Amino acid sequence: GTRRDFLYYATAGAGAVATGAAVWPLINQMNPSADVQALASIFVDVSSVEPGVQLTVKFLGCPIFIRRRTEADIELGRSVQLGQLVDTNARNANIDAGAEATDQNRTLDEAGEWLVMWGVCTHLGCVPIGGVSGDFGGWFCPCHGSHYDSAGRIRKGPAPENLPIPLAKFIDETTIQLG
């Protein structure tokens, strides 16, 4: 009956498991190795940054933008209404995940002078060009034409979201701890 039919299943079932156990390590070896996963934090000296200067710093193999925004940059950022944004989420690791993308929720300080964010376009990862570039007085990504405003919020192009803001906080008057 079904006694010799079950053997041909049990044999094949064991072979499938054995194969899967062999295929997974061939895939998982390409996932981040232990030196990469050993994520590290850094400190950035900021005493030399005048208003209107963008500092670009490497962190975990990617750029982080630390811009001391000018008066014009700050005014423009606060003038945008929520309903005018492509992406209304703050994308800010330092506050609640549901926070709104107001200019206040995009800076580390209450005065809104220090804009710290990943300099990694949310479309396909290129690095947007700063120095008040683009059509919204912010950043322009030259890879496919995304325009960000003075708070790093996406306004135009294929990119779906605002530039993410990492965990960042002033440790003292002049030092930010990223991560």
Binding site: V36, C126, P158
Partner: protein, 428 residues
């Protein structure tokens, strides 16, 4: 398949080998296949592609004897090849420009097939195997371009691995797995080298099936009329053996193609390249004039044409509850453009094989060819007006040709009668 005479061992060495391993018999039956007499100059690109694959492999292997896949040494090791290795400058330029020649050949090869109905039954398998080869070539060519570790190398790799990050749910997982970390670094360079080496051998295996596929069915010809198979007498009036008649014509055409190719490599080796890749990769800045390799421009233009403002993107976003945003739509559109071209045997509903006898088809085909050149041109332009519209109109026509025109054309068009046989067309 076609009626023909078979091999017979003559020398004592041949009688010995044939009774043990009929490899000479296989080479004979392969190289002596009866081929339609009326093949024109558009049938040469198969041999050109074969040469390119061999050229790339031997120059590739040689370059790998002097190249170091490490971020601190990759760019320096390429200059070591250019400056110190005997003939290294020429081997490097041959491999780089050889990739361009490789892609010029496929596009002519593909559009030849699309015109003459070389994808229609019984040749579906040849076409699908071709599409697999084409994906491997692009993936292979992509990874090769990353190895010098210039600015275009580094940021192109960021973008192209980013395509997979656009997949809902699992996209970020796949991207990290491809990257080996949070961002493009040394782990990425090391693995692209291994995969760049592997894939040309996979392409070679596919080409063997590709060659096996159209040998089983026989080559198409400009008339779309099949060789008569009822007897050897009339099969021979429609055909001549591949060797020597078509070997020499192909080798001749190849010599002319390679004559031009070696003039490019010798006298303008950088015309088809991007100057920004002679700058070392800088992960903290993207060049302003970043542009893909020319053979990627049509698909690049398609992807970036679909921004958040495009009406069809906004419908997709609404119907998909936000899952399909501009980012994912452009990736789907780019790979979708390739997919619809793979499905063309089942979208072209006309029973007439050759487009030579399809009056309406000719119009829309040459529009597609023109569209492909246009798509290449807009790919290198900015995304401002009017180029943004030119790329939308061009992208729209590409999908319309395969998905709308071709199905409709096969149920409306009144085709002209083709010749009775290949012989009639040849004598004419």
């Amino acid at each position: 398949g076609i009626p023909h005479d078979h091999y017979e061992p003559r020398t004592g060495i041949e009688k010995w080998l044939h009774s043990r391993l009929p490899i000479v018999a296989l080479a004979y039956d392969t190289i002596m296949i009866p081929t339609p007499r009326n093949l024109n100059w558009m049938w040469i690109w198969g041999v050109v592609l074969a040469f390119c694959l061999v050229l790339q492999i031997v120059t590739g292997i040689v370059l790998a004897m002097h190249y170091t896949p490490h971020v601190d040494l990759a760019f320096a090791s390429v200059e070591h090849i250019m400056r110190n290795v005997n003939g290294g400058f020429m081997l490097r330029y041959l491999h780089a420009n050889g990739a361009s020649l490789f892609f010029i050949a496929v596009y002519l090869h593909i559009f030849r097939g699309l015109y003459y109905g070389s994808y229609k039954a019984p040749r579906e398998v040849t076409w699908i195997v071709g599409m697999l080869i084409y994906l491997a070539m692009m993936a292979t060519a992509f990874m090769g371009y990353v190895l010098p570790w210039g600015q275009m190398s580094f940021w192109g790799a960021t973008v192209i691995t980013g395509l997979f990050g656009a997949i809902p749910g699992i996209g970020h997982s796949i991207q990290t797995w491809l990257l080996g970390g949070p961002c493009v670094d040394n782990a990425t360079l090391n693995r692209f080298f291994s995969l760049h080496y592997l894939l040309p051998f996979v392409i070679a295996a596919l080409v063997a099936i590709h060659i096996w596929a159209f040998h089983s069915t026989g080559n198409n010809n400009p008339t779309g009329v099949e060789v008569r198979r009822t007897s050897k007498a009339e099969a021979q009036k429609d055909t001549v053996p591949f060797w020597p008649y078509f070997i020499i014509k192909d080798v001749f055409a190849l010599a002319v193609v390679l004559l031009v190719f070696f003039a490019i490599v010798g006298f303008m080796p950088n015309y088809l390249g991007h100057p920004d890749n002679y700058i070392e990769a800088n992960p903290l800045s993207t060049p302003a004039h970043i542009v893909p390799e020319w053979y990627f421009l049509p698909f690049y233009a398609i992807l970036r044409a679909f921004t958040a403002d495009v009406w069809v993107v906004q419908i997709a976003n609404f119907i998909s509850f936000g899952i399909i945003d501009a980012k994912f739509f452009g990736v789907l559109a780019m790979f979708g453009a390739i997919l619809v071209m793979a499905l063309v045997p089942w979208l072209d509903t006309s029973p007439v094989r050759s487009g030579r006898y399809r009056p309406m088809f000719k119009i829309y085909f040459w529009l597609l060819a023109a569209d492909f050149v246009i798509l290449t041109w807009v790919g290198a332009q900015q995304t401002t007006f009017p180029y943004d519209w030119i790329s939308l109109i061009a992208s729209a026509y590409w999908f319309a040709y395969f998905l709308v025109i071709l199905p409709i054309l096969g149920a409306i068009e009144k085709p002209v009668a083709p010749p009775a046989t290949i012989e009639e067309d040849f004598n004419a």
